[PDB]
Structure 1
Amino acid sequence: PVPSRARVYTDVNTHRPSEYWDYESHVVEWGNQDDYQLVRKLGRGKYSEVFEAINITNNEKVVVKILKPVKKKKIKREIKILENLRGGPNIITLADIVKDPVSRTPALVFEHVNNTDFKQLYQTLTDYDIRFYMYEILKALDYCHSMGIMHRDVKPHNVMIDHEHRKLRLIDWGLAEFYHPGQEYNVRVASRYFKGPELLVDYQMYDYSLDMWSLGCMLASMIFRKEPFFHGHDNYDQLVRIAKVLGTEDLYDYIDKYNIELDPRFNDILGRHSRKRWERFVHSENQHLVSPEALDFLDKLLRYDHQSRLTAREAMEHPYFYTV
C-alpha cells in the first residue's frame, strides 16, 4: 500500500526524548492499596472492574479500576499515557497506581466524576447543549493529539458528563497509542459502530484522524436521534453499512488511492450504493437539533479518506461553534 502521514502534530514524538514515548522501558511504582476503602461496584468491562472508593487519608471519594493482567505491556502503555496527559483539559485524572498486598492485582485510582445518565439527558438536550459538549470533547482531542497520542476508542461510553456542573471527561485510555509517522498499527481497535474505514479495509498506516471519524459517528447519532448511526452486525458488515450512506464509488476511489487489497469476504455483501443527502435523516422528532451549520460540519467529519477529514483544531473553528 501507498504510505500516509498526519496533516497536524506529525513529528511531535520524533522531537522528544525516548523516555516520553517508550512505554516498554517505563518503570511503574505500585503503591499500597490499604489507603483506599472500596465502597460499591460501578461497572464491569473487558478485563476490568470499576469501583467507587474512599481515600482514608483525606476522606475523599475516588474511582478505582482493577485490571485483569492479561497483557502486561498494555498496562504499561495505559499508565505512561495517563501520566503524560495528567492534568490536561477534560482528560480523566490518574491520582494513584496501587496493588492490594494479598492479591497483587494491578489497580488505577482516578479523580471522582459524578456522571448523569445518557438515556435521561436524551429527552431534554437542546441544540446549544450539543454544541457545548461537542466543543468540550474537541478540547480533549486537540490536547491529546498535540501530545502525540491517538485515543482509538472514542464513543459515548468513554465520555463522562456531570450535567449539573457542565463538566466533561474523556476516559478509558486502554487502547490509546503514540503516533510515529510511517508506523503500521494494529487495526483491531475501537468499538464496531465507531471503527473507521481504514480499520475495516486493513490499512495499518493510520493517525489522529481515526478519532475524528468516531466523533462524527457520535454527532450523527445525537442530531438525528439514531443510536448507533452505522449499525453493523460484524466487522465486514460495518463497511457495508457505511457504503449505504457514502456510496460504493468513493470506497473504490479510496482503496485505489492507497492501493489497498480488499478482503474476498466483501465480494458477496458490498453491492452497489448511491451517495445519500444528509437532509434525508431529518424528521419531526429530531428537527429541533438539525441546522445547515450542523450538516456542513458532519459532512466534513464522515469521509472515507482519513486525510480529508477536519482536524480537531480545524473543527473548533467551524461556524457550528460560533455560539459557544
Structure 2
Amino acid sequence: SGPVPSRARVYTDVNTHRPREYWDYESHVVEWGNQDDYQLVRKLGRGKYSEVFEAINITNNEKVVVKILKPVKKKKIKREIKILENLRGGPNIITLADIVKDPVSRTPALVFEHVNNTDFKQLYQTLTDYDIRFYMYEILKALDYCHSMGIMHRDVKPHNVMIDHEHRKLRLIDWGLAEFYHPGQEYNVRVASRYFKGPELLVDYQMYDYSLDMWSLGCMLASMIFRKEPFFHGHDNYDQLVRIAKVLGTEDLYDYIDKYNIELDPRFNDILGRHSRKRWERFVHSENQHLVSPEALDFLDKLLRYDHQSRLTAREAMEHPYFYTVVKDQA
C-alpha cells in the first residue's frame, strides 16, 4: 500500500515562501579566502568528515577554529555552507567566520569563531538540576530558530554542543548533516548518531521533519537526569530500536507502524517481541534523585514518542513548566 505521508505541525511551508537562492544550495557560489591569512596552532580533535584545528588570524591576531573538510560531494559542502550563512547570527548558533581552501589537500575548510572548547559530555558529571534546565533551554533557542528557518539539524548530540560554562554561553555546532525542510520530501534515514536516531530512522520512514531533532534532545535529557550516557545503548540500528522498545513499550511501536503504514523489516519481528511501557520512576536511583522531578519526567515523556507528530515542538518545549524557573531569571 505504501507509507502514509506526513507533514510538520510547525514551520511547514517556510522555505516555499522564501526565494530559490535560500534553499537551492546547489546553485550557491562560494567566495574563497586564502589560508595564508590563517596559521594552524594545534589540533582540537579528529572526525569522520573533517579535522578540526585551533588557528590564529594573522591580520588581527584573533583566535579562530578551522574545520578542514574531508572529501565529500560538492553539494553537501555547499549545503553546510549555505545553512551556516542562513543561520548566521541566530541564537546559540555557531558562526561561520570565513570560507577558505587549503593549500595542501586543496579541500575547503570552514573557519568559525573561537568558542571555549568544552564539550557537553565532560560537563555532564558536574551539572546541577538548574544548569541542566538552563542549557536545555539554550539548545531549545537554537533549535527553534533553525526550525523556523526551515532547517533540520539531523545530528543533535552532546558532542555537538559547545558550552562556555564560565560565561554560560552555548553553541550548537556541526551542521554538516543539516538539511532544509520541504513538505513531501523523503530524506535519507542514515543520519545522526546511533544512540540518538529517532524511531522513524530505525524503521526507515523517510518523510520526517524537525521532530527528529526533538527525539535526539530527549535522548540527551534522559542521559543527563538519569545519569546514564547513553540512555538507549544499542549495538546496531536494529538493536537500538529494541532498547527503545524495552522502555517505551512495543504497544505504541506497532501502533506507530500501523498509523503510517510502515513496511517493517522482517528482522525486527524476531527481536522486538512484546514489552511494557516502563515508568520513569524505575530509572531513578540515589545518585540522580536531585536531577529528577515531576516536571522533568513530564517534559521528557513528551519528547520521547514513536509518533514524531506527537513530540513537542521546539517552541512548545520552551513553554513547559520544566523551564519556568529558568525563564523567570532571564527576565
- Taking structure 1 as the reference length, what is the TM-score of the superposition? 0.98
Matched, 1:37 2:39: yes
Distance 1:123 1:266, change over 3 A: closer
Would you say how many aligned residue pairs link Structure 1 and Structure 2? 324
Work out whether residues 120 and 162 of structure 2, in 8 Å CA contact, stay in contact via their aligned partners in 1.
Answer: no
- Structure 2 counterpart of 1:82: 84
Give the Cα–Cα distance (whole angstroms) in 2 for the partners of residues 122 and 187 of structure 1.
28
Secondary structure of 2:281's match? helix
Aligned partner of 1:280 among 279, 282, 299: 282
Work out whether residues 115 and 163 of structure 1, in 8 Å CA contact, stay in contact via their aligned partners in 2.
Answer: no
Alignment of 1:1-324 (within 5 A): 1-116=3-118, 118=120, 120-323=122-325
Work out whether residues 209 and 311 of structure 1, in 8 Å CA contact, stay in contact via their aligned partners in 2.
Answer: yes
Secondary structure of 1:139's match? helix
Question: What is the CA-CA distance between 1:73 and the residue it aligns to?
Answer: 1.4
Question: What is the CA-CA distance between 1:261 and the residue it aligns to?
Answer: 0.7
Question: What is the CA-CA distance between 1:99 and the residue it aligns to?
Answer: 1.1
Per-residue CA distance 1:208-254 (angstroms, 9 max, x = gap): 00000000000000000011000000001111110000111111100
Secondary structure of 1:20's match? helix
Secondary structure of 1:77's match? helix
Give the Cα–Cα distance (whole angstroms) in 2 for the partners of residues 263 and 253 of structure 1.
15
Work out whether residues 245 and 274 of structure 1, in 8 Å CA contact, stay in contact via their aligned partners in 2.
Answer: yes
Distance 1:267 1:219, change over 3 A: same
Distance 1:118 1:170, change over 3 A: closer
Give the Cα–Cα distance (whole angstroms) in 2 for the partners of residues 144 and 226 of structure 1.
28
Work out whether residues 80 and 175 of structure 2, in 8 Å CA contact, stay in contact via their aligned partners in 1.
Answer: yes
Per-residue CA distance 1:27-67 (angstroms, 9 max, x = gap): 01211110001000010001310000000000000000001
Question: What is the CA-CA distance between 1:72 and the residue it aligns to?
Answer: 1.4
| Most deviating of 245-254 and 109-118 | 109-118
Question: What is the CA-CA distance between 1:119 and the residue it aligns to?
Answer: 5.5
Question: What is the CA-CA distance between 1:117 and the residue it aligns to?
Answer: 5.1
Per-residue CA distance 1:112-166 (angstroms, 9 max, x = gap): 0113354653343211100100000000000000000000000000000111010
Per-residue CA distance 1:54-96 (angstroms, 9 max, x = gap): 0000000000000112321111110010011111110000000
Work out whether residues 34 and 100 of structure 1, in 8 Å CA contact, stay in contact via their aligned partners in 2.
Answer: no
Unmatched runs of 5 consecutive residues or more in structure 2 = 326-330
| Most deviating of 245-254 and 114-123 | 114-123
Work out whether residues 120 and 161 of structure 2, in 8 Å CA contact, stay in contact via their aligned partners in 1.
Answer: no
Give the Cα–Cα distance (whole angstroms) in 2 for the partners of residues 207 and 142 of structure 1.
13
Give the Cα–Cα distance (whole angstroms) in 2 for the partners of residues 270 and 27 of structure 1.
48
Give the Cα–Cα distance (whole angstroms) in 2 for the partners of residues 247 and 122 of structure 1.
27
Work out whether residues 52 and 63 of structure 1, in 8 Å CA contact, stay in contact via their aligned partners in 2.
Answer: yes
Work out whether residues 52 and 68 of structure 2, in 8 Å CA contact, stay in contact via their aligned partners in 1.
Answer: yes
Question: What is the CA-CA distance between 1:101 and the residue it aligns to?
Answer: 3.6
Give the Cα–Cα distance (whole angstroms) in 1 for the partners of residues 47 and 125 of structure 2.
27
| Most deviating of 97-106 and 1-10 | 97-106
Work out whether residues 214 and 311 of structure 2, in 8 Å CA contact, stay in contact via their aligned partners in 1.
Answer: yes
Give the Cα–Cα distance (whole angstroms) in 1 for the partners of residues 266 and 121 of structure 2.
39
Work out whether residues 32 and 101 of structure 2, in 8 Å CA contact, stay in contact via their aligned partners in 1.
Answer: yes
Unmatched runs of 5 consecutive residues or more in structure 1 = none
Secondary structure of 2:52's match? strand
Identity %: 99
| Most deviating of 80-89 and 69-78 | 69-78
Distance 1:241 1:4, change over 3 A: same
Work out whether residues 121 and 159 of structure 2, in 8 Å CA contact, stay in contact via their aligned partners in 1.
Answer: no
Distance 1:313 1:192, change over 3 A: same
Distance 1:120 1:261, change over 3 A: closer
| Most deviating of 100-109 and 288-297 | 100-109
Question: What is the CA-CA distance between 1:265 and the residue it aligns to?
Answer: 1.5
Work out whether residues 96 and 111 of structure 2, in 8 Å CA contact, stay in contact via their aligned partners in 1.
Answer: yes
Per-residue CA distance 1:154-186 (angstroms, 9 max, x = gap): 000000011101000000000000000011101
| Most deviating of 7-16 and 120-129 | 120-129
Work out whether residues 152 and 175 of structure 1, in 8 Å CA contact, stay in contact via their aligned partners in 2.
Answer: yes
Give the Cα–Cα distance (whole angstroms) in 2 for the partners of residues 2 and 45 of structure 1.
37
